[PDB]
Symmetry: C5
Subunit: 335 residues, 5 copies
């Protein structure tokens, strides 16, 4: 038989507990890429990101060299992973890797270029930016890293040209939640201390959100919670039922932030700009409640003057709303 | 003894780390099917699907051949799985496979047709369609795939005739949530790059929802949240308590979308058509609030004219509702 | 030494990868029972059931036979499980078995009757009936099944007499949520196809719910949400504040179904009969809102006639409530 | 070298698959205790308890005997656990043990007293009592049990004197949620059937709750939801806005039980006595709504008589509240 | 070949089940540090903390000594972890360690200084302080501990100088939720009993919260839920709609504590001081409801006296609010 004659010749004395090389000064350079498949979920409140990545490796292993002659011209061959060496690479930003299944097999070639594929899901922790919530651009980081070995032992480089990883839209699942512009690779040499230096190669993946689901469901409710009191201002502020017309909005609007405030994270770089806007709309409707109650103490045992000291309060409204159409377009002109 | 004499003769030198064949140019074709048992849950918000599938395999292994003579006419035999080869197939759309228990045993035959059964549950990620929410048809995808090996090494085909998989309603658990029409198999040859080609065989499973639980509980509440203001229009719009009759609906209806908007996913192909309808019913009741407040500024220190400029607003209502009975029947005429 | 002399004599050549028998035509019949300990949780919405079962097995293994002579009259002996054979039985309705800990040891006897105990928890999927929610009887199914082996290889039977399993209330944890009447065993011969036949033995476990927690907390609130408007009918329907008395109930009652509708599953055999009753109480209070608003358009610039066309609406109420005391007693006469 | 000369002499022929003894009639008595560290969580609704326990064992293993002479006076020694025997003990009330990490090592002595430590967390299921909710005493049960072996094989006893386990407050984490009085050990001999008998040793751990967080946050809101209508009774019941003053409490108080009713379990031994009290306060405020509406039908085209038939309704209030100060003190006199 | 000649010479007889030393009286001192990377989440209600720590070890193993001569001057070498000894250290405050992936490899040197790196995530249980909620300082504890071995077997010490661990801000992820001042190491000698003594070395990590997300979203709503009734006091308390103006705040403010009370833990050292303040603001607004209802029974078939007995109630308000600006600044002067 031809094929298992090779494995008997090859793995007869392959001690798997050795980083395999003939000359130990040379670092066995592993070499990878990523092909990002899908973005599963971005829970902003938990400060984590789950990502499904197809993944590839090769590295030069000299102990696994044969000749295609004397084995009937076999140049590719399958080997169980735990019967050979594997590099100790993993990611500096994981939370739980127990969701990736173990691919049992690898390829090898007659030069010793052992080739490994596996998928890997990472609930990964990168500090997401929540500045402009319905139009956010995300700059997330995957730093694939030798956890133990140093620059003398292994070094990291890329499989292909870095421009090819950049616009790789070969496989992706759109019509989900997100959509990415590009995947940015960049080497970095890491050294936390003296006399130590660790091979790292980052991946600045960047994604942006499709806003159209929030367009009808989130800020279009923010439209007629802002137009309800403008036309709700038009009746003369001496009906008496103005305060029952108005305070039912006010604590009713407290649940609109506190649902969103428990949705959105505790990052102190800022409350989102969509979030700061309906708190400030609540910061200017409440002073109108003073104005509809000072008039009824005034009209008590200057009626035209209450109409015009409160008419200047109406100018406060469309000062804010006409300040708000520009902050959407100057976010619409970001993507 | 007869039976373990066979296993001693058979697995004496079976090196499990070799894709087993006599001639390595021939690809060892695995051959499967599915018998879909139940659909556990469809959480629309997480963009995932959990599915319980009974599952089958065989492939031709020449190293496990014997003769039924000299072993007392034994033609079937049980073998532990991790003592032989297994193909590396798994699914391109998983999230977590740690819910399937390991079936320890397989069959073999005297031709070498090793036969494997196992169940497998997949929390699987397929981009579900949320266009018509209470009557949706789902086109979900299971792509069973050699994760590592190529067309030279293994190829995928089907067990039985593809028409038999199509209407296979042998075992299924109805009276759950869903009900499927058919399971559609289709081969595809996959090749992401040059000089590589990977055996894939999809499964376009398609399911549709029984709407009868939402019939009483979801859109029948949408009936009398739409009939409440029609008869709530009939009193003459000068009672003064019209606005307290009406605004209590309006922000009260904001919680009806925002419960559903946090239930339903952020897919930007569309808000559901059932969901877009009670936002537009909210988009036309709010302009009536202008009409019940412009009349009370008009009636202030043309009364018949307020009755008829607002009567044309009543025509806006049954313009929308009679536009809504057709969009249910033209979804009732989809299934 | 006496005891480990036996294990050296017994497991010297016991190849564990063989279904152990001397004559392979004879099927090695396993033989089990269950002793149901507790019912952990019934989440109706997820269509699953978690159950803690004490569990037992034996089967005749001829290769493990010795004589009590030459071993100082030893008739029972402990063996590690993964050093012998085990049948491949598991349950057709699981969701996740990773909650059962591995019992490492088994018994054997001098006849070869290897005996195995283990506990097993199953989040199990059986189509629960939600017809009569506070008084439901549940007919759930546990089908213990050879996943791989057929009728020629193994067969399933019961340990004890089937009447003893029926009323087995030896160990159970009452004062929890549920309480079972009986556990019903029944053999079935399973054969999905031709030339194949698989040993199955079901367990129709049936449980019923103690209603007393819902008695005060669920349908006693349904009492005075139904008596609140009956006495709330008694004031004459021309107070003007009748609509503010009444519509605050109506959308306030919409949250009473939509909390329960997201609690209770999407099974289309029916909304529960307790659930269909307070939607129909909402279906008849809303037409009273028409009656309290048609009278105020009538009383506008026949007063005794509005009192009696609405008095017949009062007969609609106790037509429904006196139709409701019978549907509880005819559920109280089910258990 | 001295130390690994011992392990080579000791584990040369130690067949781990034998319950180790020289004479098999003698049962190898294991011997344990517990040192309860912390109580993590008590979710009442799931009927489970998570508990972090430090844990200890020893048992007499005669096969591991040596002499301190010829090994340089070594009397203690470390051994990997899976290279020796271990008893099969585990707990009858677990839900999931996959949270305890595997302690790899054990001690031994020159007498053969092998000593084992390990921590173990148990999400454990014991039928908790919910009678008096803010002052509850809990009688929970941990039954450490040989799952397989019988009285002939192993027996269970205690490490130390049972009075020392009783008041063991050496290590505990207070300022959490709970605080225990004592840990009560008690042997029991278990025998579910004939010809079988299983070594069990229970642990009646008992804990009680610190009520001070619920003191301000749970029943102090129950104070001014009961004083709000008493002073809300003082205005004369002919204001007309009494019903809008009152029904807004009533369905508003329905959400106060139904938040708590979905918090608290479905045990039918009783709704909690704190829970039964604000349902009965709701059972007596609703009949006052009849009294404030029968008077306005009376005062319609006996005014002093409506003041005094409703004054006797005021006596119903402080009949209930003065019946309620005693049920707190007679729970304050339980701890 | 040079490198695997070493591993064949080194691990030929290395029995891994021995704590490796030449003289057993000497304790093999392990030696560690921590480099705290990120704080993932602090769920106050579950009384747990999840922490991602980079982690380091070394210990002197004499059995792994070689000379750099005869191996081509190799001074560093990689070894699989489960092929050598490892100390049994783990943490006394874990909940679940199954989130840390297994680093397969370690270093060694020609002196025998075996060096080990691994990451480790701990959902860890330390009694967090909830006294001053938006400005809290946390004193959490990580006690790295030999679970089994004693002072004779292993001892714990630190890698580097303890001042270097103190201000180690080399790698940290800020712009998350938290920010730490320092990491405090301290040895402690632990001995729960007589004749036993266990090596422990604590880590008093201390973190404090950035308050700026709660600044706009949590206590700025607490501003205008306190200013709404102050200006809502200014109208004269005889409008009649004062009670409908006021009670709608009161039970509406009950949901503001009971959302937070189910957010915040059941620790009985105290309700938070931010939490005790809006319960006492609710404790003083409710007595104003008595004052707005005693006046309307007074004004019934002394009007200026109702204005001034209630004006002293206004002094109660800014007695509390001016007592509240100091308790923020005297928390602003804590960090
Ligand atoms: C994401 O953020 C990183 C910063 O960490 C950006 O990296 C910078 O990229 C520019 C462009 O090449 C360089 O000049 C800087 O030196 C980089 N800084 C660092 C610290 O790496 C990165 O560009 C951002 N992603 C995108 C898409 O802009
Ligand atoms: C480790 O790998 C990096 C690249 O992964 C090496 O950087 C290369 O350095 C050479 C010369 O020093 C340049 O010609 C290449 O263009 C560099 N590549 C990149 C991507 O920048 C680095 O030299 C390696 N170090 C060692 C010690 O092997
Ligand atoms: C689910 O969607 C796929 C599209 O991905 C449909 O597949 C098409 O099927 C038709 C009918 O045979 C072919 O003509 C097309 O070439 C297929 N396209 C692709 C991309 O596969 C599939 O039919 C859909 N499912 C159902 C039940 O209609
Ligand atoms: C891999 O398998 C597919 C089917 O699984 C093969 O497609 C078959 O091709 C032959 C001739 O090329 C046809 O007669 C069959 O009808 C095809 N089957 C189907 C289902 O379409 C394919 O040829 C195989 N390729 C290799 C290299 O083995
Ligand atoms: C649970 O449902 C099953 C139906 O699947 C019932 O099984 C039937 O039992 C009767 C009584 O022996 C038989 O006559 C039928 O042939 C059975 N049918 C099937 C399909 O098994 C079972 O009785 C139900 N449980 C209870 C307690 O009534
Ligand atoms: C497989 O087991 C079942 C029972 O588990 C066998 O059914 C028995 O059949 C015999 C005669 O055929 C009857 O006398 C018994 O009363 C049956 N038992 C029961 C519980 O019904 C069945 O025959 C077995 N089949 C094989 C091939 O062994
Ligand atoms: C917890 O409940 C058990 C009952 O299961 C109590 O056990 C009883 O204790 C008394 C006092 O020794 C004995 O006289 C009884 O015989 C015991 N009964 C059983 C069934 O064990 C136990 O005392 C309770 N815990 C506490 C602290 O009182
Ligand atoms: C099994 O262990 C229990 C204790 O764990 C034994 O009970 C002891 O019995 C002896 C005499 O029978 C008494 O002197 C002791 O005081 C008992 N101990 C306790 C704690 O009650 C029991 O006898 C043992 N049984 C066997 C067969 O070994
Ligand atoms: C966290 O709390 C511990 C108390 O457990 C503090 O430890 C004390 O520190 C002081 C300062 O060195 C010592 O004098 C005490 O003896 C320590 N007591 C104990 C019990 O260890 C620790 O200082 C606190 N953390 C911070 C940052 O203050
Ligand atoms: C165990 O280790 C601790 C330190 O980790 C030792 O404490 C040292 O003791 C010596 C003399 O007793 C002092 O010179 C050092 O300064 C101490 N170190 C520290 C950090 O305090 C302790 O002696 C060791 N014990 C044994 C038995 O080895
Ligand atoms: C192997 O390959 C070489 C070159 O491709 C060729 O000359 C030779 O004939 C081949 N031999 C076999 C057995 O295929
Ligand atoms: C085996 O099978 C063959 C053909 O089926 C038959 O001729 C022969 O007698 C059988 N032998 C035994 C021992 O069953
Ligand atoms: N069957 C797809 C195998 C495969 C093809 N190309 C790939 C790229 C990356 C990867 O992880 C895997 C793959
Ligand atoms: N006992 C059922 C075994 C079985 C019968 N037919 C099957 C089909 C598929 C499968 O995974 C399993 C099976
Ligand atoms: N210690 C209880 C062992 C045991 C006794 N009877 C049993 C019955 C079933 C079972 O799984 C286990 C048991
Ligand atoms: N380092 C603490 C080891 C330890 C000391 N005493 C203990 C008691 C029980 C236990 O599980 C463990 C221990
Ligand atoms: N590649 C980073 C390896 C590393 C460098 N310094 C470290 C410190 C601690 C640690 O666990 C790990 C490390």
């Amino acid at each position: 038989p031809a094929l298992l004659r090779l494995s008997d010749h090859l793995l007869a004395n392959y001690k798997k507990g050795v980083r395999p090389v003939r000359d130990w000064r040379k670092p066995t350079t592993v070499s990878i890429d990523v092909i990002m498949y899908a973005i599963l979920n971005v829970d902003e409140k938990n400060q984590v990101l789950t990502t499904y990545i197809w993944y590839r490796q090769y590295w030069t292993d000299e102990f696994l060299q044969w000749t295609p002659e004397d084995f009937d011209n076999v140049t590719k061959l399958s080997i169980p992973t735990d019967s050979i060496w594997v590099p100790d690479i993993l990611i500096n930003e994981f939370v739980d890797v127990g969701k990736s299944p173990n691919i049992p097999y690898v390829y090898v070639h007659h030069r010793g270029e052992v080739q490994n594929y596996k998928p890997l899901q990472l609930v990964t922790a990168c500090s997401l930016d929540i500045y402009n919530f319905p139009f956010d651009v995300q700059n997330c980081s995957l730093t694939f890293t030798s956890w133990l070995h140093t620059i003398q032992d292994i070094n990291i480089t890329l499989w292909r040209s870095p421009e090819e990883v950049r616009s790789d839209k070969s496989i992706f699942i759109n019509q989900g939640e997100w959509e990415l512009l590009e995947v940015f690779p960049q080497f970095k040499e890491f050294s936390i201390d003296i006399s130590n230096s660790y091979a790292e190669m980052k991946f600045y993946v960047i994604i942006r959100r499709r806003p159209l689901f929030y367009a009808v469901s989130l800020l279009l409710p923010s439209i007629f919670l802002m137009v309800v009191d403008i036309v709700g201002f038009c009746l003369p502020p001496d009906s008496g039922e103005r305060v029952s017309f108005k305070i039912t909005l006010l604590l009713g609007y407290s649940v609109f932030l506190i649902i969103v405030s428990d949705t959105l994270p505790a990052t102190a770089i800022g409350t989102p700009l969509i979030g700061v806007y309906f708190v400030v709309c609540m910061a200017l409707l409440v002073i109108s409640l003073a104005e509809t109650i000072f008039i009824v103490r005034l009209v008590h045992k200057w009626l035209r003057v209450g109409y015009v000291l409160d008419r200047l309060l109406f100018r406060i409204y469309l000062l804010a709303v006409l300040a708000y159409s520009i902050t959407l377009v100057t976010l619409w002109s970001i993507w």
